[PDB]
Design an enzyme around this catalytic site. Structure first.
Site, short mmCIF file in Angstrom:
data_model
loop_
_atom_site.label_atom_id
_atom_site.label_comp_id
_atom_site.label_asym_id
_atom_site.label_seq_id
_atom_site.Cartn_x
_atom_site.Cartn_y
_atom_site.Cartn_z
N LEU A 114 5.82 0.86 3.97
CA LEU A 114 6.96 0.08 3.52
C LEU A 114 6.53 -1.35 3.22
CD1 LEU A 114 9.29 1.23 6.44
CD2 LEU A 114 9.16 2.31 4.19
N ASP A 115 7.33 -2.04 2.40
CA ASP A 115 7.04 -3.41 2.03
C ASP A 115 7.94 -4.37 2.83
OD1 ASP A 115 9.16 -2.31 0.76
OD2 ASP A 115 8.76 -3.19 -1.21
N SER A 116 7.91 -5.65 2.47
CA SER A 116 8.58 -6.68 3.27
C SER A 116 10.10 -6.55 3.18
CB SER A 116 8.14 -8.07 2.81
#
Ligand code: CDL
Ligand code: CDL
Ligand code: PLX
Ligand code: PLX
Ligand code: 8Q1
Ligand code: TYR
Lengths: 56, 69, 88, 178, 52, 458, 175
Positions: C42-44
């Site tokens: 997952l990203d930020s």
């Protein structure tokens, strides 16, 4: 043994003695202002068969 | 569970309050009892005319027994 | 009385419950030590959404400076326990 | 509140903080859950539309425009968590918080109750007294010559050490003291 | 406080109230005005002879 | 009235003959007994004064002031023995001697029948106060404070002396009864104007009047606790008592000589109340409070009505008690933390609850919550001022709003909020401090129960 | 009761109507007042009877003090201190008595206003007129003397008013 107690707590009569002496001096001062005793127009009164002065 | 509750010292405030109550009451309960007993058994004076030829004392010009005293 | 005395097991259960309701995380592949970026990919922005979901679940706010650092369910559980004075 | 701040915020940090603020205020506007989910997905799409901009100047211009739009369209009365700095229960229980050193001033009659608690307190005080000098020495060693540059503190590294400056963090009163 | 509370009425409040009661009774009985604008009898006052 | 004067003079050698560890006990016990004796002066007449002799007399204006002085001496002794523990025996006896001499001078000042004897005693009060301030004050500024305290007073009182002797060459007497009975009007001439100013300015600087008040914050901040108590509670009232005595010979000049002083009093009351809103030192706030209340008293004396005189008497008594209590409350915190900065120690209600209750009651009496005698005096003065001119209700009204604000501000700064983390030396309140607060506050409410004892001769 | 003079503090003859029940229901007020009587008024009456019995066994008296009249301030020489002192004391006593007279009249006015209820504007006319007259006389006598008032200032005020009235009368005579 009361010698040590007296010499430790004799300073406790100075203020009562001063109070008594102040009362006596106030009475003496009142004694010097009787020029109008029983002489004011408002309070002038005939003496009782016994009493000598109206106030001291 | 039961947890410890951090508080400041309540001992000294309680001690002061108890001491103040004790001394105030120590002198004020006898005073209240004396006032009640005087009021019940030595009432107030009744206003009356001055009888002819009588010169009342100054304290006789007041009605409450404690004030007269 | 008031709310029951929240425990570490309850906090971990609720955190995992919230995480398994996220459609971007596979339930079986998820563990208490899985990293959001490395393990789960997952990203930020997903992490921000996860932090917000935790905030909604537990009814209090996590400041941004503290929320940036949380990267696995264990860190979230530890942060919540430390905030709420949970020791058992 | 727990982490030591840095000297400045980075561009990514500012973007993420704006994203969180925008989503919170949009939820304040969109009271119902389904409507909020719809518009939050729209906001996420709008945010990641310009995610792959290699020109940093254009990225900061976009961030500037987004912050201006947020300030224009912010909710004047956004939802605040009750214990958050603007909430209705923000500092409600601060009057019930009593520092631990007050226990040193209890009358011995008060301390006659709770014997075991005060024995444990004596143990903790002994531990703090024994650890202080080692904490100070570790801080003296690990600090650069021109003073510290951040507010971050080191952990314990030795056999039976304790992390320096731990007493007032560990002995916090409570969140619900009384 | 007890000594002050029972101080005798040397301010003559009750005496003044009783005197006023007697005065009001007498004046209302004889139909005189309750109070006079002059507190001194004019027959004991000698005004200046000329005002011009 | 030697039955009160002689026991104080006996306090002197009783203190100097006491055992080294019994000075405080003996002084406190016999001071309280003297106060009990002086309680008998409250039996006053409705027509004239108690004329004890050719030298001393008691009125319905001076008797509550004497009672306040004699009651304040034991409180000062109780408040002083904490910070004087390290002192040598001889210096402690000298400090107690200064306090006793101050009480004697005040007692004789409030009962002197002649104006020159009153002047001599009212100047004699200067020496013990100056010695106390400059010898037992804590900081280096005390010396300057002493100078400000001295010359500000004397520059006012030296003209008065001249006027006094001049009056005795004109009328033949300075006896107050003769002066009252043989009163004659003052014509409108320059000589009469300057006589009025000479008769008024000393009492004006004693109150103090706004613009002549700069000595007061210095002297009342730099002094030890007993010095501040006696400066705020009694020594400020010398000006009001002297003005109410001296105004009997100044009519009808006052009718227009009061305008500059009335304007100064009202506007400076607003100004000092405003100054209290931005003050970093807790003692200076209480000093400026005293200035505002005394401005009210000055207005009451200057408008010269029976209601204003009653209000002035009540306000002087109430302010004496309240300001002394506030100074003691601030001194407790100062002794704990050794600093007078108000924002240093905060959230003290969490650490000291009963002291917080004392703070609340003192600040409630400061803002004149009804039916306290503070409020009675303030309301009587405001009603008299309204009769004098309907516009005064503006300025007075503004004052009532500001006072409460700063009063509550003080409370909210010291008792509420969160405690300062690094201050860990706040010990529980001693029995002595709680007893001091109670002995301040209980007489206030007891006097509320019977207000005619502090309403004066009018 | 007989504690106060009923001519100094008069009251109307106190007409009150007789109960006229029109409903078969009982009156809770009558039942509650019977309970109040039996439960409160009787023990208090017994306690008062005991206290009065104790008082009757110790009966003593106090007297109203009498003051004769001394010469007024008008009959005093300019510097005669003793006559001035006696006159000033007499004047102060008269001032207090006048204040109490005004107080009695105000008490009458207030009592009438409360007593008459909704008809007070018409039924308190006499008390209002009496208060108006007494207030005018008192204001003429004592107003504006200021603090430091005395008999001499009152005499000066009366002389000034007398001079003004005499001048006005003589000027109206010339009309
Ligand atoms: C706690 C401490 C902590 C710190 C706190 C700080 C404390 C600081 C204290 C500082 C010191 C203060 C000292 C001040 C001195 C002042 C003393 C004084 O002057 O006394 C005045 C006054 C006495 O006046 P007085 O001039 O002596 O009396 C003149 C007459 O000659 C008398 O009339 P009489 O001939 O009818 O005789 C009456 C007699 C007898 O009367 C009766 O017996 C009749 C009563 C009714 C009974 C009738 C029914 C009951 C019996 C029936 C059943 C038995 C009979 C049948 C048997 C069979 C049973 C069926 O009773 C009395 O004598 C009066 C009581 C005496 C009280 C004296 C107070 C002294 C206090 C000093 C100590 C201070 C510290 C406090 C400690 C005190 C102890 C706690 O005392 C009162 O207080 C009376 C108040 C009660 C009146 C009723 C209240 C009316 C309410 C109206 C307001 C409504 C608004 C709501 C508010 C209500 C809240 C109250
Ligand atoms: C009105 C009710 C009447 C009740 C009838 C009996 C009343 C007896 C009271 C005797 C005098 C009070 C003693 C003063 C020292 C305070 C005691 C203390 O140090 O606390 C330890 C003691 C130990 O408790 P603790 O567990 O250790 O907690 C202590 C903590 O520090 C924390 O403690 P805390 O959180 O519980 O707070 C302590 C408390 C205590 O702090 C105080 O504020 C009490 C001092 C009064 C305020 C002073 C400035 C106000 C100027 C008015 C002057 C009125 C005096 C009247 C004559 C008094 C005669 C001595 O403060 C308060 O609770 C709130 C104060 C707000 C009062 C607002 C009312 C304004 C005036 C309203 C009517 C006044 C005139 C009545 C007649 C009007 C026409 C019908 O505290 C208590 O027991 C509670 C105090 C009771 C509150 C009394 C408030 C109402 C009474 C006002 C005057 C009395 C008039 C009586 C005539 C009959 C009516
Ligand atoms: C800690 C717990 C606190 C709360 C619990 C308290 C429990 C109850 C106690 C509270 C009592 C409530 C007070 C209600 C008033 C009742 C008493 C009142 O009726 O007495 C007054 C009397 O009070 C006193 O007069 C006032 C006290 C005098 C004040 C002097 C203080 C002592 C000197 C101390 C130093 C002085 C410093 C200040 C210098 C000026 C009325 O006087 P008066 O209407 O006439 O009486 C007419 C009949 N007489 C004349 C025959 C007596
Ligand atoms: C910082 C605060 C200090 C304390 C404040 C003290 C207040 C003192 C102020 C004095 C009040 C008035 C003093 C004299 C009354 C009238 C003054 C004068 O201005 O009025 C006119 C006076 O006319 C002219 O003004 C002449 C006076 C002008 C010269 C005075 C100098 C004032 C200038 C300001 C100097 C600042 C003084 C204070 C220094 C600190 C009235 O006309 P007139 O009817 O004919 O005079 C009445 C007297 N008669 C009847 C005998 C003739
Ligand atoms: C209540 C209503 C008011 C709200 C209105 C708000 C309007 C604003 C909407 C549009 C704002 C934008 O898109 S501003 C577009 C800004 N674009 C860039 O900066 C490009 C460079 N990319 C990055 O910095 C990172 O990829 C990053 C994006 C941080 C992701 O972080 P991570 O991948 O490392 O987690
Ligand atoms: N100067 C007033 C003092 C006073 C006030 C109230 C009273 O109840 C009594 C006396 C006289 O008259």
């Amino acid at each position: 043994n009361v010698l040590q107690i007296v010499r430790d707590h004799w300073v406790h009569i100075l203020v009562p003695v001063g109070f008594v002496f102040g009362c006596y001096l106030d009475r003496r001062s009142d004694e010097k202002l009787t020029a109008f005793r029983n002489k004011s127009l408002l309070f002038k009164r005939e003496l009782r068969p016994n009493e000598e002065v109206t106030w001291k | 569970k039961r947890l410890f509750i951090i508080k400041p010292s309540g001992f000294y405030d309680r001690r002061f309050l108890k001491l103040m109550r004790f001394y105030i009451l120590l002198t004020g309960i006898p005073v209240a009892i004396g006032i009640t007993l005087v009021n019940v058994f030595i009432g107030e004076a009744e206003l009356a005319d001055i009888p002819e030829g009588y010169v009342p004392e100054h304290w006789e010009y007041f009605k409450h027994p404690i004030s007269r005293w | 009385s008031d709310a029951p005395p929240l425990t570490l097991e309850a906090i971990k259960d609720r955190v995992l419950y919230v995480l398994k309701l996220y459609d971007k995380i596979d339930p079986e592949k998820l563990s208490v030590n899985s990293h959001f970026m490395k393990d789960l990919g997952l990203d930020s922005l997903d992490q921000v959404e996860i932090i917000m979901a935790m905030e909604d679940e537990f009814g209090f706010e996590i400041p941004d400076i503290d929320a940036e650092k949380l990267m696995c369910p264990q860190e979230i559980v530890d942060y919540i326990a430390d905030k709420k004075d949970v020791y058992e | 509140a727990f982490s030591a701040p840095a000297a400045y915020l980075t561009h990514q940090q500012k973007v993420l903080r704006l994203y969180k603020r925008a989503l919170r205020h949009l939820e304040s506007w969109c009271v119902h859950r389904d409507k909020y989910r719809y518009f939050a997905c729209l906001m996420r799409a709008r945010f990641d539309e310009h995610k792959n901009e290699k020109d940093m100047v254009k990225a900061t211009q976009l961030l500037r425009q987004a912050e201006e739009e947020f300030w224009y369209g912010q909710h004047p009365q956004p939802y605040i968590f009750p214990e958050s700095p603007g909430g209705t229960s923000y500092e409600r229980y601060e009057c019930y918080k009593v520092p631990e050193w007050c226990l040193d001033d209890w009358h011995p009659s008060e301390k006659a109750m709770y014997p075991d608690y005060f024995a444990k307190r004596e143990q903790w005080k002994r531990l703090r007294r024994e650890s202080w000098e080692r904490e100070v020495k570790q801080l003296q060693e690990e600090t650069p010559p021109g003073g510290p540059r951040t507010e971050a503190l080191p952990p314990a590294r030795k056999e039976g050490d304790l992390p320096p400056l731990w007493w007032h963090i560990v002995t916090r009163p409570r969140e619900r003291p009384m | 406080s007890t000594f002050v509370a029972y101080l005798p009425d040397y301010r003559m409040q009750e005496w003044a109230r009783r005197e006023a009661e007697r005065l009001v009774k007498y004046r209302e009985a004889n139909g005189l005005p309750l109070m006079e604008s002059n507190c001194f009898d004019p027959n004991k006052i000698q005004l200046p002879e000329d005002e011009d | 009235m030697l039955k009160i004067i002689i026991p104080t003079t006996m306090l002197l050698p009783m203190t100097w003959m006491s055992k080294h560890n019994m000075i405080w006990i003996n002084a406190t016990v016999h001071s309280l007994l003297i106060s009990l004796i002086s309680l008998s002066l409250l039996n006053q007449l409705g027509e004239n004064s108690l004329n004890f002799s050719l030298t001393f007399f008691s009125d319905s204006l001076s008797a509550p002031l004497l009672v306040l002085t004699t009651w304040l001496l034991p409180l000062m002794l109780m408040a002083s023995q904490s910070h004087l523990s390290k002192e040598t025996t001889t210096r402690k006896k000298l400090y107690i001697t200064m306090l006793i001499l101050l009480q004697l001078f005040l007692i004789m000042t409030f009962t002197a029948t002649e104006l020159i004897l009153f002047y001599i005693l009212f100047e004699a009060t200067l020496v013990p106060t100056l010695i106390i301030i400059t010898r037992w004050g804590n900081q280096t500024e005390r010396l300057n404070a002493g100078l400000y305290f001295l010359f500000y007073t004397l520059a006012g009182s030296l003209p008065l002396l001249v006027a006094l002797v001049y009056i005795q060459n004109t009328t033949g007497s300075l006896n107050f009864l003769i002066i009252h009975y043989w009163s004659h009007p003052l014509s409108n001439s320059w000589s009469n104007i300057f006589m009025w100013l000479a008769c008024i300015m000393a009492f004006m600087v004693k109150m103090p009047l706004y613009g002549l008040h700069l000595w007061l914050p210095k002297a009342h901040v730099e002094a030890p606790i007993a010095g501040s108590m006696v400066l705020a509670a009694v020594l400020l009232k010398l000006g009001g008592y002297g003005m109410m005595r001296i105004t009997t010979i100044l009519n009808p000049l006052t009718n227009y000589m009061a305008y500059p002083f009335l304007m100064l009093s009202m506007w400076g009351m607003i100004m000092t109340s405003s100054i209290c809103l931005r003050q970093t030192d807790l003692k200076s706030l209480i000093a400026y409070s005293s200035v505002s209340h005394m401005a009210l008293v000055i207005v009451a004396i200057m408008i010269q009505t029976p209601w204003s005189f009653m209000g002035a008497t009540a306000l002087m008594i109430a302010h004496g008690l309240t300001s002394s209590m506030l100074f003691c409350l601030a001194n407790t915190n100062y002794e704990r933390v050794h600093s007078r900065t108000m924002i240093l120690a905060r959230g003290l209600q969490t650490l000291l609850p009963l002291m917080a209750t004392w703070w609340l009651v003192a600040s409630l009496t400061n803002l004149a919550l009804p039916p306290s005698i503070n409020l009675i005096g303030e309301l009587f003065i405001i009603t008299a001022s309204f009769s004098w001119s309907n516009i005064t209700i503006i300025l007075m009204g503004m004052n009532m709003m500001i006072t409460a604000l700063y009063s509550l501000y003080m409370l909210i700064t010291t008792q509420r909020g969160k405690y300062t983390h690094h201050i860990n030396n706040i010990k529980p309140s001693f029995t002595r401090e709680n007893a001091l607060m109670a002995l301040h506050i209980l007489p206030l409410l007891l006097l509320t129960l019977n207000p005619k004892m502090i309403l004066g001769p009018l | 009761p007989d504690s106060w003079d009923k001519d100094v503090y008069p009251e109307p003859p106190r007409r009150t109507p007789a109960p006229a029940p029109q409903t078969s229901l009982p009156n809770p007020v009558t039942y509650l007042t019977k309970i109040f009587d039996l439960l409160v008024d009787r023990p208090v009456t017994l306690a008062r009877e005991f206290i009065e019995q104790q008082h009757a066994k110790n009966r003593y008296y106090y007297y109203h003090r009498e003051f004769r009249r001394v010469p007024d301030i008008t009959e005093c020489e300019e510097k005669d201190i003793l006559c001035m002192f006696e006159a000033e004391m007499q004047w102060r006593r008269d001032y207090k008595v006048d204040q109490e007279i005004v107080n009695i009249i105000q008490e009458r006015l207030k009592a009438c206003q409360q007593r008459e209820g909704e008809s007070y504007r018409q039924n308190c006319a006499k008390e209002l007129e009496q208060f108006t007259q007494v207030s005018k006389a008192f204001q003429d006598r004592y107003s504006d003397l200021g603090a430091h008032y005395s008999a001499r200032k009152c005499l000066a005020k009366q002389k000034q008013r007398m001079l003004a009235e005499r001048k006005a009368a003589k000027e109206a005579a010339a009309a």
